[PDB]
Amino acid sequence: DRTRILAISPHLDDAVLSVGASLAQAEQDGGKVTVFTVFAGSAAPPYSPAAERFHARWGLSPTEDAPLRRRNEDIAALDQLGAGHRHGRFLDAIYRNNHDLVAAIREDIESMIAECDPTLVLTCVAIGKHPDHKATRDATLLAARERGIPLRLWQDLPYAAYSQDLAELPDGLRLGSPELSFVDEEARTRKFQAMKHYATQLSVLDGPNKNLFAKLDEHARNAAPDGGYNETTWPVIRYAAE
């Protein structure tokens, strides 16, 4: 039920990159979309050399507020998909045990669910094994289950176009069968246009010779050679509870 979709993105870019066309298609179909990003917290200059290195790679200068730049990128992108944005308080791995973080994230996701009253929640399956993706996913599974909201896990992009598939779920959980969500040409066009806004991240992901848009078209194509642009998600089955 796509009437009210709440997508939980680990970082500023992940939702658009992975489910952007399905989100666009939901909005075109008359549904309501909100993307909440967990790791969208504030940090102004001055930064650590380790952060300066990541910033320099995004094309940012020492005095520029990076998380602000990225929050602005996220707003521009989501606006093009007709999706609402909500920015979470957590700091990217790069400006900073596991249980305390998951529990903190879960509380905020519960607060977001109560506020947005969604009929469907989405988050990443955490292909690529980023610890922020694992934390976001795990917290979202707990929060959506507590609030009895249906949930799907998406195939992280572009990461899935290069490698893996097998994600390591919490105990007692496994993935249901994968489902391809097909979209029309305008939803795909809107996705790719929205992706251009995350210029900071695309300076790596669509760096010289990265095939990003081609790679994404090819990936979608591999999954359904005859039937246009598509994105993969899975339902979650709980075979065992504590």
Residues that bind Zn ion (CB under 5 A): 10-11, 14
Q: Please report how close the Cβ of residue 10 comes to Zn ion at its closest, in angstroms.
A: 5
Cβ-based nearer residue to Zn ion, 9 or 22 = 9
Cβ-based nearer residue to Zn ion, 2 or 198 = 198
- Tokens 């009929």 correspond to 119
Rounded to an integer, what is the distance from CA 187 to the centroid of its chain? Answer: 17
Q: Please report how close the Cβ of residue 39 comes to Zn ion at its closest, in angstroms.
A: 8
Which candidate, 108, 104, 138, places its Cα nearest to that of 123?
Answer: 138
Cβ-based nearer residue to Zn ion, 50 or 114 = 50
Helices (H), the chain: 14-28, 49-58, 66-81, 98-116, 131-146, 159-162, 185-195, 199-205, 212-223
Q: Please report how close the Cβ of residue 9 comes to Zn ion at its closest, in angstroms.
A: 8
Cβ-based nearer residue to Zn ion, 12 or 26 = 12
11 assigned binding-site residue? yes
Which candidate, 238, 197, 226, places its Cα nearest to that of 17?
Answer: 197
Q: Please report how close the Cβ of residue 140 comes to Zn ion at its closest, in angstroms.
A: 14
Helix axes 66-81, 185-195, angle to 10 degrees: 170
Q: Please report how close the Cβ of residue 130 comes to Zn ion at its closest, in angstroms.
A: 6
Cβ-based nearer residue to Zn ion, 70 or 190 = 70
85 assigned binding-site residue? no
Q: Please report how close the Cβ of residue 136 comes to Zn ion at its closest, in angstroms.
A: 8
108 assigned binding-site residue? no
Question: Which residues have C-beta within 8 Å of that of residue 172, sequence separation ≥ 6?
Answer: 238, 239, 240, 241, 242
**Cα(68)–Cα(11) distance, integer angstroms:** 13
Helix H, strand E, coil C: the string for 102-163 is HHHHHHHHHHHHHHHCCCEEEEECCCCCCHHHHHHHHHHHHHHHHCCCCEEEECCCCHHHHC
Cβ-based nearer residue to Zn ion, 2 or 11 = 11
Let me know: does 182 contact 26? Beta carbons within 8 Å. no
Binding site for Zn(2+), residues? 11, 14, 133
